[PDB]
Ligand SMILES: NS(=O)(=O)c1c(F)c(F)c(SCCc2ccc(C(=O)O)cc2)c(F)c1NC1CCCCCCC1
Ligand SMILES: NS(=O)(=O)c1c(F)c(F)c(SCCc2ccc(C(=O)O)cc2)c(F)c1NC1CCCCCCC1
């Protein structure tokens with residue numbers, strides 16, 4: 001009730017139906033610069049009670065295309081529980097075990113509050129997390145620290161790492177649509193890019209993610225995804241036919 | 242010299258090469274509501290020395306897509322001289338006799354100065370004017386008042402008119418890209434939408450447009466178009482296959 005933007009017509013997340021997506025060959029491969037960080041200075045990894053977030057340093061540049069430039073602010077995760085998936089986006093009604101969001105600010109804006117609700121002011125890179133056979137070493141750097149931040153509102157410093165190693169290797173094949181933040185204030189104008197390729201974590205890693213953190217009260221931080229929102233006439237674009 | 246933004250990477254106008262345009266079926270028909278203005282109140286028509294400009298009232302609403310809405314501010318024209326075309330955009334190297342620009346402000350920005358340089362802050366609808374056998378009634382309402390404002394800096398008031406009648410037939414067929422103002426300050430982040438189809442004016446009308454107005458000094462106000470700029474990797478989109 002408190003935030004009217006959460007009742008907007010063009011909200012996220014959405015159910016991606018690839019057959020109804022529009023092939024748009026203007027959608028070129030995503031470009032990331034400066035994501036391969038040195039170990040120092042350290043970054044802050046926080047259990048904010050709704051997700052686990054990693055705050056990103058200055059100098060991480062992302063482009064959705066020529067002239068569509070962004071700076072990375074933060075990344076965070078959405079996940080489920082034992083035997084329950086918890087991605088935000090779905091594909092043909094299928095929910096994936098978890099989802100990573102890397103949130104960026106258009107280089108036309110100095111602050112988030114100026115970008116909120118402005119077209120293209122914020123851009124999110126989203127990838128699904130699925131079970132694979134191997135321990136994912138980039139994820140392990142964060143997941144091995146969740147026990148330190150089990151309590152709601154706690155944080156810890158972690159060394160810099162290759163942030164791009166938390167995303168799929170295929171930056172060419174993706175869906176793109178305009179939507180909203182998935183937490184209040186649910187501001188619209190957010191460009192969502194959802195990778196075709198998924199990222200693989202071990203079963204143990206997925207369990208660590210869903211079973212370690214606590215939220216508000218004595219409740220487990222689990223199932224922290226927003227319900228699917230209707231496209232309401234928006235057409236999802238795809239970078240591939 | 243005065244405006245370094247004019248040497249930016251993502252400037253307008255550009256040469257449109259339809260075979261290299263990217264078709265995206267997500268580009269829906271343009272929606273223009275409130276454009277059928279009544280005779281009163283009257284509108285300001287001004288020779289500002291670079292173009293002739295019609296100030297538009299509040300209530301002219303335009304959408305480039307779902308939730309991507311705009312309000313029209315003004316329109317103005319670009320033209321050549323006797324036996325010389327003066328459109329700004331070109332199509333496969335062909336320059337048309339003239340070009341009309343309807344400039345709009347995004348409904349996420351209260352002021353033009355906030356929108357300048359921000360992606361999608363300003364949106365321009367552009368149409369080519371070419372020679373036809375018949376006098377165009379819509380354009381005559383404006384062209385017949387240019388003699389009154391021949392001197393640089395002079396202005397008059399004209400009755401309200403159907404602004405949409407100045408535009409081409411099919412609102413589903415257009416090209417679109419992101420670029421700049423074509424005059425200082427050459428601000429980037431402008432969404433340009435160029436109709437596929439043209440509008441037709443008589444040879445007398447086109448002569449009236451190019452031969453009536455005076456600029457700065459004792460110069461005729463003619464050939465008021467900027468040179469073609471490189472795409473620099475931008476891909477022009479098309480709303481039709
Ligand atoms: N999917 S999402 O991008 O909308 C998103 C969510 F769905 C989220 F659920 C979250 S976590 C909840 C918001 C929050 C709460 C507390 C704190 C803190 O105490 O430090 C920080 C954040 C979350 F942090 C984000 N992303 C944030 C949204 C906040 C405003 C925009 C800029 C940062 C991205
Ligand atoms: N093609 S374009 O849209 O870039 C464009 C031009 F190429 C133009 F050439 C123009 S006219 C030149 C700018 C100007 C000069 C004086 C006055 C005045 O004293 O009233 C007003 C305007 C012109 F007005 C516009 N459009 C205006 C750009 C300048 C003002 C900021 C944004 C509104 C659109």
Ligand SMILES: [Zn+2]
Nearest residue numbers: 076078101182
């Ligand atoms: Zn999120």
Ligand SMILES: [Zn+2]
Nearest residue numbers: 317319342423
């Ligand atoms: Zn213009």
